RNA sequence: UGCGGAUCACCCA
RNA sequence: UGCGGAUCACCCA
RNA sequence: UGCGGAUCACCCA
RNA sequence: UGCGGAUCACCCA
């Protein structure tokens, strides 16, 4: 085993699926990027740290690019029109058991499930009301 | 088309499900809490704002209780030993269309799907290896 | 020929054995933990480095939980009253061959074998007399 | 009884076994050395100390020599090409019972058992991977 | 998945092969060492970094030792009579796709294929003529 | 005899092959360029020198271009969108025989063989992990 | 306290 | 610590 | 940045 | 000497 495996970041039913693969582990930061030039790649980074005597903190980062082709100095280059950045920090007490942590994962999955308040608002460019 | 309604945060397949219901809306910050004491409740807050000229930023906070050896309705100190904190900040450039935002949501769902690296590590009290 | 695999740390003869499994690899420091909450888990970390021009140094750390009167999955404070810490540092001159290193390992196994002075004293809450 | 007895440090099946014997107890440090000149001897030292109000700390040291014969000033002397040094510190809480301490000993024996990750890496001059 | 694994550095048929194994990955620098005496070992290190806004730079190092036995005063140690030092730096713009990178690799493998100008000169203590 | 000849730098089956040819050998620096527009050409240079009393040092350079067409004001020129820069230095003591040099070459060819750690990382825009 | 160092019951921060 | 900011493993209070 | 040096992740202009 | 930078046989400490 090694959980540092590749996974499907954006699922579009097998056709046009954004897949992300292990690309770096330097400095304790696990990194994943899609098969693109470094300038147009989806990027995911993860790191864990004992943030205190009784706490552990996960720091996760996701970068979603809007791929474009730009003409700089009369030449064509693969670039990113802009990027969207997700930054999350999860602080878990050292007292949390394996079942306690599964409860945290389930909460995050239910938070972002299709049809629920938050993903509905984000997908429509609105707030909660 | 109001989206501030109750939803299932922790789905255990109908039996043992955790439901979170609207509980506050002070200052545009929508809040949802489970039916517990606030020291043991599941909490979710969400707010959107124009962080700058080029971006909008969603701030989602989630609080999850440590359930193992928990005494329902009891006083458990210190507070930090019994709660986990999730802090999410999504930055979306003002040029993102509904389609772009939908993709960004799929990426978040993909990052947390069962079997993937990040959720598997969190659930096993691990990092990447 | 990968050696970062799970192993039996505490052998009780098949029944009641404690298994430690790979859990982290941030910064070359390999980590193994038992299936518990991190406050009650068995932990093992290991790293090697060129401490100086003439030597290499292995740093092995082991954390063992106090099990008597322990409440599985519970919050036990203070942390120092419930854990034992083992700190090992092995310095091997760069001239040591595989044979030399094997002898050094046998010496460590010999020092801790059942019936010998050091382990017998540790197990009886004693010193030398 | 008196656990200050001689033991077999390096076991080679009865032939070429490095045996170590009680040689000193001055200043609370128990010492053992093999039957060699003090310059080529295997050395083991052990001491216990109440390192705090609620902690006890064992300090163990093992020295494995690479015996050689050197010619200084035209004369032959028994000496050590180089030495390997093992330094360990075990901190145990005063609350650990006799059964709790046996668990610590078992962990150290299982840590160094033939075929496991750590002794495998050390014996082959590599790291964990 | 992991690429910080053991690999054959020098291929001499089936036996006589020099194999290098992971030894350390501290501060973004991956290190590989061959077995036995560190003093006579082959060394391979690798690191990547963002050298500028548009460039990522690989820094690869290889050390080939000339195995020998030193003798001073009658004491003999395994050493390296001398070492050959390979030092390479590879700069690749961030607009390079996985296809462009594969070509850069083919170029490196071709520059050193048996029979070509450069490896021939090196193999014969020669230069170009 | 001469080793300042034409050779295949990038091998793509039988056709698509990049061939580099001698172009200049001024001041102890041998240079090889691929055919057509110098602006989109592959470049390879090589030089040797006595860097110190006991060492001779090779300095090899390779340039991989990203063929493109520039357009400014309507005039179009063949250019290189960008270039990948390989820079290597190989130091070899004067005591190295033709046999020792052949090993150094095998080590270089092995470091870059398909499948091994380093060429794989480079080919996938990755680092070590 | 140090996954700081050593010629190893000493030295350093 | 911030429901502070970013060009996103960095910056600010 | 050096077709600058090394005992090779350091040092020099 | 740099796991220092480059538009790459140059430039920096």
UniProtKB/TrEMBL annotation, chains A, B, C, D, E, F:
Capsid protein self-assembles to form an icosahedral capsid with a T=3 symmetry, about 26 nm in diameter, and consisting of 89 capsid proteins dimers (178 capsid proteins). Involved in viral genome encapsidation through the interaction between a capsid protein dimer and the multiple packaging signals present in the RNA genome. The capsid also contains 1 copy of the A2 maturation protein. It holds the Pfam family Levi_coat. Its main location: virion. InterPro entries: Levivir_coat, Phage_RNA-type_capsid. Belongs to the Leviviricetes capsid protein family. Keywords: Capsid protein, RNA-binding, T=3 icosahedral capsid protein, Translation regulation, Virion. Transmembrane segments: none annotated. It is found in: Virion. This is Capsid protein. Homodimer. The capsid proteins form dimers that assemble by group of 5. Twelve such pentamers are linked together with free dimers. The homodimers binds to the viral RNA via an operator hairpin, but also to many other RNA sequences in the viral genome; this interaction probably shifts the virus from the replicative to the assembly phase and ensures specific encapsidation of the viral genome. It comes from the Viruses. GO terms for molecular function: RNA binding; structural molecule activity. The keyword Transcription regulation does not apply. GO terms for cellular component: T=3 icosahedral viral capsid. It comes from Escherichia phage MS2 (Bacteriophage MS2). The keyword RNA-binding applies.
């Amino acid at each position: 085993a090694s959980n540092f495996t590749q996974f499907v970041l954006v699922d579009n039913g097998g056709t046009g699926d954004v897949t992300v693969a292990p690309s770096n582990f330097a400095n304790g930061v696990a990194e994943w990027i899609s098969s693109n030039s470094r300038s147009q790649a989806y990027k995911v980074t993860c790191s864990v740290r004992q943030s205190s005597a009784q706490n552990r903190k996960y720091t996760i980062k996701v970068e979603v690019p809007k791929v474009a082709t730009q003409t700089v100095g009369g030449v064509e280059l693969p670039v990113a029109a802009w990027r969207s950045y997700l930054n999350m920090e999860l602080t878990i007490p050292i007292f949390a058991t394996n079942s306690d942590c599964e409860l945290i994962v389930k909460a995050m999955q239910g938070l972002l499930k299709d049809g629920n308040p938050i993903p509905s608002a984000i997908a429509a460019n609105s707030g909660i009301y």
